[PDB]
Amino acid sequence: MRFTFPLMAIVLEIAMIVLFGLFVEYFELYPLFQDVHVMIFVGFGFLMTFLKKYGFSSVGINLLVAALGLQWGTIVQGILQSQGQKFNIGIKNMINADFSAATVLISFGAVLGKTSPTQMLIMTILEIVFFAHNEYLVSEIFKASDIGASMTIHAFGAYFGLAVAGILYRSGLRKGHENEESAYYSDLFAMIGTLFLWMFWPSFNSAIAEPGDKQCRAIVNTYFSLAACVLTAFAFSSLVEHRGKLNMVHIQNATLAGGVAVGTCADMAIHPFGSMIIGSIAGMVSVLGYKFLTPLFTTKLRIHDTCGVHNLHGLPGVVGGLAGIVAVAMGASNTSMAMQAAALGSSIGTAVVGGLMTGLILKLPLWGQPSDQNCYDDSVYWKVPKTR
Amino acid sequence: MRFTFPLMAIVLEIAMIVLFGLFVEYIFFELYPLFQDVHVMIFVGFGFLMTFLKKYGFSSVGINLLVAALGLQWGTIVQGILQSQGQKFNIGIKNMINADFSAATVLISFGAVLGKTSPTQMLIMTILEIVFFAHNEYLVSEIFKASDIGASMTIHAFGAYFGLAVAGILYRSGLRKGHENEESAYYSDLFAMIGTLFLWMFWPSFNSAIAEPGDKQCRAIVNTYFSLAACVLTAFAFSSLVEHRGKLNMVHIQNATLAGGVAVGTCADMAIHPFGSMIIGSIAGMVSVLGYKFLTPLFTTKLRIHDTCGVHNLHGLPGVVGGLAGIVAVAMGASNTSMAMQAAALGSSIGTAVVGGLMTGLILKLPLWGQPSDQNCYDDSVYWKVPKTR
Amino acid sequence: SSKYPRSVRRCLPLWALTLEAALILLFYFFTHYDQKGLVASYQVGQDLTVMAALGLGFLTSNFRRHSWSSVAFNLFMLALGVQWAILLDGFLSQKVVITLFSIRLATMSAMSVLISAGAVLGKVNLAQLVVMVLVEVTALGTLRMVISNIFNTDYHMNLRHFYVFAAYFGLTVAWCLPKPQRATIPSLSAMLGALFLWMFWPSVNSPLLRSPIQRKNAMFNTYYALAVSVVTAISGSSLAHPQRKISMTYVHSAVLAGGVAVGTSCHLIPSPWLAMVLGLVAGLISIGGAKCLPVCISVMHSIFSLLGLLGEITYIVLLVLHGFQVLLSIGELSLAIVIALTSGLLTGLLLNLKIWKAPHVAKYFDDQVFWKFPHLAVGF
Amino acid sequence: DAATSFLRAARSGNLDKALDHLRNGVDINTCNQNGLNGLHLASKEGHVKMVVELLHKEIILETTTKKGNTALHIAALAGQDEVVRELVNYGANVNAQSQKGFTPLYMAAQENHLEVVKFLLENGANQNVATEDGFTPLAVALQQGHENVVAHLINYG
Ligand SMILES: CC(C)CCC[C@@H](C)[C@H]1CC[C@H]2[C@@H]3CC=C4C[C@@H](O)CC[C@]4(C)[C@H]3CC[C@]12C
C-alpha cells in the first residue's frame, strides 16, 4: 500500500508529540553539540552517497532516520535516566539523542539499498530502544567507561545492523548487483562525509567528557589516533590492491577507524603515542576487513553489509573495547577490568539479539521492500531526474 | 553594455568604504560560534540550496556569494545608522549577526527570481531590499516592540513577499508554461542537499543568536531543534502523500524540511514547550509541502508570479504561520507583549515587503542591466565560462 | 619510457608505514601531555583544521579527472604534516608538551604545505608529496628559528610569514617538475572548499594573537576585507577573461585576496575602512594579475605570490605608523623568500629522482594513475 | 643466469649485450616468471630497435604472458606508439584477446593513448570485441572520461 509510509511517519510523529507533552520540560557545550550534529547529518549522510544510483535515498533517509531518532532517543534515554518521571532537556540530552541517531545510522549502513523508508522508521524505533537500554546498562549498572562509545554506539550499531542484514538476506544479491557500484562524482560526494567525520570526531569523543583533564585528553587522543589512522589506512589500501592503487572504499571509511578504536580510551591517560598506536592498528584492521572479511561475510556467511560498517564500526569498536580493557590493566584508568569486558560483551550481545528481533519484524512483506532487481535504486522511492 | 556590472560593483564598494570610514568604528567570543554557524548558513546553506538547477549551479552559488558579501557591508551601515540615528557607532558581534540576517533576507528574495536576472540586477536588489528590510525590522523591534527573535515575520515572510513582488513585476510570458533549463539533475540535487542540511543543522544558532543570554537563548535552541525534527517527518510524509505513486520529491525534501525552523522563529524564545515547537514544526512541514504541490502551480500559471525556488512555500507561508503562532502564544500567556503588536508586525512585514518589492522590481525591469533573454534563463553560460564537461 | 604507471605496491606502503612508525617512536620518546576556555581555545584549532582538510582539500578538486587525488592527498598530507610539525616545533623551540595551542600551530605549519601543494597537485604521486611535506615543514621551521635567533622574535610568532613562504616554495617546486581541464561538478565542489576557506579565514588571521582586543580587531578586519575582495573578484573577473565571462576558477582563488592582503597587519589596522581599502586593492591586484601574469605554471599560485608580497609591503607601510625597523623588516622578508626559494629548489630536485616512480608527463591530472577503477586491464 | 641477463638487457634496451647473449646461444624465446619474453619487455620499454632485432631473430610474434598479453597488448597499454607501429608492420594480430578478453584497442582506449587508438582503428581493430565484463573500448573510454578517445571511437565507427 502506497499510504503505509506517510501513515507510519505521521503516527510516529504524533506519538513523539504526545510523549514530549507528557514527559519533557525545559551553553558551553553547544559548539561541541553542533560538531556532533554535523557528523550525524552531513558526515554519515554523505558518507553513504557512494552508491551510483542511491544518493537521494542515502542522504535523505539519513536525514529522516536521524530526525526521528533524535526525538525518540530523547524520550527513551530521558525516561531511563528519570525512571519514568518528567525530565528537563539540556544540551547533554541533545548530544545523547544525536548519539542514538548515529547508532541507527551505523546500522542503516549495513542494510543500505535493500530496505524501504518504512522499514527504516521501524528500525529506528526498535533499535533506539535496544541501544538506550544497553547504554544504560553500561553506564549505570556496569559503570564502565566508554566515553567515545566504541562499544555502545559503534560496535552495537555495527552488529545490530549485521543481524538485521542477516535476517534480510537475499540469495539473489550474494554474488553482487549491477546497481551496487560507485561512480566517480559519487565517490567525490562521499569524501565530503568522510572529511566532516574526520574533522569533527574529536568533538564526538569529548562532547560529554568530564570537563577538565578528561575532556582535553579525549580531544587530543582522538585527534592523534585519527592522524595515525589516515597514514595506515592509505598504506594498507595500497598494500592490498593490485599495483598499489588506492581504493576509494578504504580512503572513505578506514581513515575514520581511529576515531572508533580510540573511543573507549579517549579520556584515559594513554598518551598521544598510545592513541597513535591505536589509530594505526585501527586503520590496518579496517582496510583488512574491507578487503578480506566483507567478501567472506557476504558470500559464505550470507551477511551482506553494503557500506562495510563491520570494518569501520564493528571491528574497530571491538578493538576499542579491548584497548579499554588493556588500558585498565595498565592502570591508565580506575574502572574495573571485568566491567569493561562485561560492557563489551553486553554491547555485542544485545546488539545481535535486538537486531535479530528487529530484522524478523522488518522481514514481514508489509513495508514496501524493493525487489532484488530494484535494490540500490533511488527510483523505487524517489522521483529521479532525467540526467546526472 | 559590458562594464555595467564591474562599474556598479566598484562604485558600490567605494561607497561602502566611504560610509564605513564616516560612520563605523571598532560578549564577542561568547556569541562568535553562533555567528559562525549563521555565516555558514548564509554562504553555504542558501548558496548551495539553490544549485538544484541543472545548468545554473555557478550562478546560484556565486551570485549568492556576491549578494551576501555586499549585503553584510550594506546591512551593517544601514542597520547601524538606524540604531544610532545618524551618529558614528561601534560594531560588535551583534552588528555582524544582524548584517548576515539582512543578507539572508536578500537571499530569500533572490530565490524567487533565480535564473531570470543578471548579477547587476542582484546588486541593485540587494541595495534596495536591505533598506526596506532594515526599516521594517526597526519598526517591528522599536516602535511596535514585538517579539520576533527567529524573524519568521521580519526575515522570512518579508523576504518571500518582497521576492514574489519583484518576480511578478519581472514576469515573463514566455516562462509561464515552464522552461527546458528549469530542471534539476542528480548531482545538482545532491549539492542542493548540502545546502539544505547545513541550513537544517545550524538553524538553532540562527534563531538563538540574538536571544537574551540564559533561559531565552536555550529555549530558542531547543525549540528550533525539535521543531525542525518534527518538520522532517511531516515533510517526508506529505511529499509521499501528494506525489504520483508515493515517490518522494527532492524539491520537498530540500525545502519543506526547513519550514519548521522558519515557522518556530517568532515563538523560538517563548515558553511554548518542546511539544508546542513540534506541533508548529509538524504543521510547517505539511503547509510547505502542500504549497509546493498546489500553490506554486497556481501562483505561476494563474497569478503570473513565477517563484523559481518556491520561497513562498518555505519562507512565505511558514513565515505567516510563525507570526500567527506568536499571536496565539501571547494569547496563551506564553509571552509578554501584546497580541495587537504581534499582529501589527505581521501586517507591516508583509505590506512593506510587497510595496518595496514592487518599486524595486520596477527599477530592475528597466532594459539596462543585461538580464537574460527568455531562451537563456536558468543558464550559467550567459555570465559564466561553463566547462564543456559536466 | 612506459606511460603505464609502475607498481607502487611496495614503495608507498613501506614509505608510509615506516613514516608512521618513526613518528610514533619519536612521540613516545619526546612528547608529553598537558580549563574554563578549553572549548573556546579548541574551536580556533578546529577552524584551522576545517580550512586545512575541507577548504584546501576541495579547493584544488576543480580538475576534470583529478578530484579524488586532490581531496584524498590533501587529507594524507595534513595527517602527516601535523604530526611532523608537532615534533619539529618541539625540537627547534626548546621535551615537547602537547597542548591544543601546539596542535593549532602545527596545523598552521601543515596548511603552509597544503597551499604549496596546489602548485604541484596533478603532477606528483603520494610519495613525492610525503617528501614535500617533510622538507617544507622542516624548512619553515628552520626559517622561523633563524628569524628568532637573528631578529629576536618568538619562534611561534614568526609563523606569520607562512603565506609568503608557502606561495614561493610551491612555485619553485612546480618550476622544477617535468612539463605537461575543468568540469562543472568538480567546479562546484571546489566552490564548497573555497567558501569554507573564505568563511573561516578570520581564524587564520588570529591564531597566534594572545590578547582579546587584537583578536577581535584582526577578525573584524579580515571579515570586512574578505567581503570587499569577493565583490571585486566576481565583478572584475569579466574584465580579465578573453570571453568577458566570470571564471569560476579565478573566483575560487580571488575570493581570499583581501584575507592574504590583511593577513600580517589586521591586528594593526585600526579602523574597518582601511581594511576595506586593502581588500579592494587586493581584489584589483588579483584582476590585474589574472590579466597580465599569463603573458609573462599555475596562474592563481602566481597571483597569490604577489598578494602575499603585497601583504608584507602593507605590513611595512603600517608598522612605521604604529627607518631602521623598515630595514629589519625588509631583511626578514628577504630572508623568508630566499629560504622559501632555496628549499623549494632542493625539494624539486629531490622530487625529480627516479625512485619516486612519478607519473609520466602524458598522465598528469589523472586519478587513474593512483586509484583503482573497475573494468580496467591491470599489469602486463 | 645467461637468460636472465638477456632479459635484463632487453628491458634496459642494451641491444649490444642482448645480441652478444644471443650469439653465445641464449634462447630467443626465453621468458621471466611473468611470461614476458624479450619482445614483451622490449615492447614495454619502447625499445624499437630491440623489437626489430628480436623479430629478425625468429621470436614468436603472438606469444602471450600468463595474463594472456601479446607484445602488442603490452605496447598498447604502455603507450609505445612507434613500437605498436613496428609490431603491426611485422604482422601483429591487432584483434587478439587476453584471458579477461581485453584487446589492444581496449588497452589503448583505457589508458587514453590516442595515437595508438588511431593506428589500431586504421589497421582494422574492431571496437566491438567486448571483454568478459561486457565492456567495449568506447565504454571504458567513457568511464574514464577519455573524451578525445571517445570522440575518435564514435567518429570512426
Ligand atoms: C551480528 C552477526 C555478526 C552475527 C549474528 C547474526 C546471525 C544470527 C545471522 C547472520 C547470518 C544469518 C543467516 C544468513 C542466511 C540465512 C538463510 C535464509 O534462507 C534464512 C535465514 C538465515 C539462516 C540467516 C539467519 C540469521 C543469521 C544466522
Ligand SMILES: CC(C)CCC[C@@H](C)[C@H]1CC[C@H]2[C@@H]3CC=C4C[C@@H](O)CC[C@]4(C)[C@H]3CC[C@]12C
Ligand atoms: C586491541 C588489542 C588487540 C590490543 C592491541 C592494542 C594495544 C596496542 C593498546 C591497547 C591499550 C594501550 C595502552 C593503554 C595505556 C598505556 C599507558 C601509557 O602510559 C603508555 C602506553 C599504554 C601502555 C598503551 C599502549 C598501547 C596499548 C597496549
